[PDB]
Amino acid sequence: ACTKNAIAQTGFNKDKYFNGDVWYVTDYLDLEPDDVPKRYCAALAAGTASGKLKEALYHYDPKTQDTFYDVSELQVESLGKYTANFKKVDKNGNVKVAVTAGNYYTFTVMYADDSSALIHTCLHKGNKDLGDLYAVLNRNKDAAAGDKVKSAVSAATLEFSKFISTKENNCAYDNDSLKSLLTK
Ligand SMILES: [N]
Numbered sequence: 001a002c003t004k005n006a007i008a009q010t011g012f013n014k015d016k017y018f019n020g021d022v023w024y025v026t027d028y029l030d031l032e033p034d035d036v037p038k039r040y041c042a043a044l045a046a047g048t049a050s051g052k053l054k055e056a057l058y059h060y061d062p063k064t065q066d067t068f069y070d071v072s073e074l075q076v077e078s079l080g081k082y083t084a085n086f087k088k089v090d091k092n093g094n095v096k097v098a099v100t101a102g103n104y105y106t107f108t109v110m111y112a113d114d115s116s117a118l119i120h121t122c123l124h125k126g127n128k129d130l131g132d133l134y135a136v137l138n139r140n141k142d143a144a145a146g147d148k149v150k151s152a153v154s155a156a157t158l159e160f161s162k163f164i165s166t167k168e169n170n171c172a173y174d175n176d177s178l179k180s181l182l183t184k
Contacts, residue, residue, distance in 0.1 A: 001129060001130075001131065002106075002122035002130070002131055002132045003031065003131070003132060004031070004120060004122075004132045006081075006108035006110055006120035006132075006156070007108070007110065007156075008078065008079060008080025008081050008108050008109055008110065009080055009109055009110055009111050009112055012079050012080035012109055012112060013112065014079065014080070016112070016114060017046055017109060017112050017117065018046045018047050018048055018053060019046070019047060020045065020046075020047030020048075020049075020179060020182060021045065021046075021047070021139065021179075022043055022044070022045045022139070022173070022175050022178050022179065023043065023044050023045070023046065023117060023137040023138070023139065024042075024043045024137060024138055024139070024140070024141040024166075024171075024173065025040075025041075025042040025043060025044075025135045025136070025137060025166055026136050026137065026138050026141070026143060026144075026145060026165065026166055026167065027135070027136040027145060027160075027163035027164060027165050027166065028040070028042075028133060028134065028135045028136070028163060028164055028166070029133070029134040029135075029158060029162055029163045029164070030131060030132075030133045030164075031131045031132040031133070031134075032130070032131030032132075035130055035131050035133075036133065037061055037063070038164060039061070039062050039063055039166075039168075039169050040059070040060075040061060040062065040164075040166055040169070041058075041059070041060040041061075041062055041166055041169055041171035041173070042057070042058060042059050042060070042135070042166070043057075043058045043141075043173050043178060044056060044057045044058070044137075044178065045178035045179050045181065045182055046182075047182045049182045049183045050183070052073050053073065053074040053075075053076070053082070054071065054072065054073055054074065054182045054183075055071070055072050055074055055082075055084055055107070055182075056069065056070065056071050056177075056178045056179075056181035056182050056184075057069060057070040057071075057072075057086070058173065058174070058177070058178055060171065062169040062170060062171065068088055068096075069088070069089050069090065069091055069177065069178075069181060070086040070087060070088055070089060071086065071087055071089055071093065071181050071182070071184050072084035072085055072086045072087070072104075072105075073085075074107070077106075080108060080109040080110075081106070081107070081108045081109075082106065082107045082108075083104055083105075083106050083107075084104055084105050084106070084107055085099050085100075085101075085103060085104040086099070086103055086104065086105065087099045089181065089184060091174060091177040091181075092177070092180075092184075093180070093181055093183075093184030102124060102125075102126060103124065103125050103126065104124050105121050105122060105123045105124065106120075106121065106122045107119060107120075107121050108120045108121075110134075110152060110156055111148070111149060111152030111155075113148055114139070115138060115139045115140070115143070115146075116136070116137065116138050116139070116143070116145070116146060116148060116149040117136070117137040117138075117149070118134065118135070118136055118137070118149055118152045118153060118156065119134065119135050119137060120132060120133070120134050121133050121134075121135065134153075134156075134158065134163070136149055136153070136163065141171065141173065142167065145160065
């Protein structure tokens with residue numbers, strides 16, 4: 001189960017974060033660390049599409065080749081804190097698994113600047129028992145975490161040394177598909 005009420009960034013700039021561009025996960029920390037693989041690739045796009053706040057997700061297990069995309073229309077709980085009832089889609093937005101009650105994640109932006117971010121996400125998916133998952137994001141898929149975001153990790157009372165990097169997995173991303181999924 002999730003256990004953290006993550007605090008959103010003071011002064012979070014939603015229009016900058018939700019600008020339609022792609023964020024790559026560079027490092028992640030799962031508080032129940034056998035819940036997710038030790039090697040992984042994920043990315044997201046975040047934006048407003050026809051007035052609706054949206055997020056598109058991409059996951060890829062670099063060892064198993066398991067791939068999936070998702071889209072959600074996000075609901076606001078408070079500035080920087082969202083609830084996302086997701087649908088699994090193919091890369092073109094065709095629905096594979098429809099939105100359903102109890103399939104949602106929450107999403108808190110703890111720190112963001114134009115290039116980097118720290119987020120907390122709590123996934124709920126059917127009767128699975130999942131824990132808190134923090135992610136360091138960057139606009140550049142290869143970027144090492146800088147001082148701004150690492151300081152934010154410390155300010156959240158987390159140890160960056162415990163985060164698992166995604167950089168050594170040969171991750172390649174379809175940026176076009178994430179951007180276009182925002183409209184789907
Ligand atoms: N996740």
